[PDB]
Design a protein around this ligand. Structure first.
Ligand SMILES: CNS(=O)(=O)Cc1ccc(Cl)cc1
Ligand SMILES: CNS(=O)(=O)Cc1ccc(Cl)cc1
Ligand code: NA
Ligand code: NA
Ligand code: NA
Ligand code: NA
Lengths: 166, 166
């Protein structure tokens, strides 16, 4: 089922979410299925559970169709560790902040760990857009959105209007 | 005539505007008239010329109808000076950033100086919302918008969704 995505300004996006403790359950697999459905109907590349007012350390992300393909992934209890100090700027937008985007610095190289909805462990090294998406969704699980990370406010604006060439 | 208001992301909002040098002219009085018309149709309380892609140190502002009434004013070549170090937080939104608002600290007490469209000097002390509006519009004449002034990102969100009690 498609769930409503709450927008920036909702206090429910500013919470620190507790862990998932029902790995392997029918209830988790249903929530994850709704998340993938929801993300797809909104044409997102990532969606975290707090964005559908579900207070849990859970996100879905990934796509074929521009950057290189990111595998379709549902990840509970995510933990992230940079694998280098190197930062890279790139464009970010967010389904909870419709119409806008900005340039945001992220770590270029990370590892992330957690669990798939069936309880099996996930751990991967990621770089570039893949790594960016996982950092951006992880921020939602700690009550953070991308505007508080903008450094260059010239790059923040409506998608149909911006002409900034990063 | 009503003019289009350009939105955040337009480079034309990020310019430093030159002075008005046609005080008393028919062309200035027509531009000012369009600005008041434009501001009123959008229900604004302030509008600066860069917001209608006119690169000039010129703003209009003011209203009867909530804060205390601010006199309807057209002000060219504005210069602002704080009259105290005291800052105050308050809600700001912007016609070039439709749908959003945030809490922004401004100087509580200022003087501002410049010229009315007929060339006569204007100088006034202002406080509270009056002072805030003039500082906010003045920022447009130096290529600045309110997001680069937010300190507490919990307060930034869509007007129909926020429940932050300042
Ligand atoms: C999940 N969000 S994100 O910032 O990491 C990926 C993204 C990048 C650019 C745009 Cl316009 C939208 C989303
Ligand atoms: C001209 N802009 S402003 O921030 O100074 C006045 C204002 C205050 C609150 C809202 Cl929601 C909109 C405008
Ligand atoms: Na928070
Ligand atoms: Na690690
Ligand atoms: Na600028
Ligand atoms: Na002064």
């Amino acid at each position: 089922m498609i769930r409503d995505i709450i927008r920036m300004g909702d206090k429910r996006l500013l919470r620190v979410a507790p862990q998932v403790t029902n790995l392997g359950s029918a209830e988790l697999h249903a929530l994850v299925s709704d998340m993938f459905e929801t993300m797809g109907a909104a044409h997102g590349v990532g969606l975290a559970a707090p964005q559908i007012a579900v207070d849990l350390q859970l996100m879905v992300f990934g796509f074929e169709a521009e950057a290189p393909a990111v595998p379709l992934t549902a990840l509970a209890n995510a933990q992230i560790e940079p694998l280098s100090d190197e930062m890279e700027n790139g464009w970010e937008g967010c389904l909870s902040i419709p119409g806008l985007r900005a340039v945001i610095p992220r770590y270029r190289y990370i590892r992330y760990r957690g669990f798939a909805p069936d309880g099996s462990p996930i751990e991967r090294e990621a770089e570039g857009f893949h790594a960016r998406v996982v950092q951006h969704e992880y921020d939602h699980l700690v009550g953070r959105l991308y505007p508080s990370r903008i450094e260059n406010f010239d790059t923040f604006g409506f998608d149909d209007v911006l002409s900034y060439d990063l």
